[PDB]
Amino acid sequence: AIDIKAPTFPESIADGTVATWHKKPGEAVKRDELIVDIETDKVVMEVLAEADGVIAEIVKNEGDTVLSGELLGKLTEGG
């Protein structure tokens, strides 16, 4: 189980914006496989999976705004 939420934004920035949900919640994932990108004031990050398993569900959509500690989704066990 691995909770996936936005990173803590610094002072210059006070929020962020999802990038693009390549895949969706409810499909098979594979360790070392991107899952969701993140967008910042001027920095683009990436969210890869830290282990195979099955996604749970995404609360934020693409092109949406996220806050510091915003739960974007949760990963399920795998095995």
Q: What is the DSSP code (8-state) at residue 40?
A: -
Give which of 33, 44, 17, 43 is closest to 75, Cα–Cα: 33
The dihedral sign for the CA sequence 52, 54, 56, 59: positive
> 35 in the Ramachandran plot: left (φ > 0), alpha (ψ -120 to 50) or beta?
alpha
Edge-first strand listing for the sheet containing 2-5: 2-5, 71-75, 53-58, 28-29
Give which of 48, 46, 47, 52 is closest to 31, Cα–Cα: 52
Experimental method: NMR
CB 71 within 8 A of CB 2: no
Domains and their CATH numbers in the chain: 1-79 (2.40.50.100)
Give one DSSP letter per residue of 6-34, joined into a string: PPPP-SS-S-EEE---SS-TTSEE-SS-E
Nearest 10 degrees: CA dihedral of 28, 62, 59, 16? Answer: 120
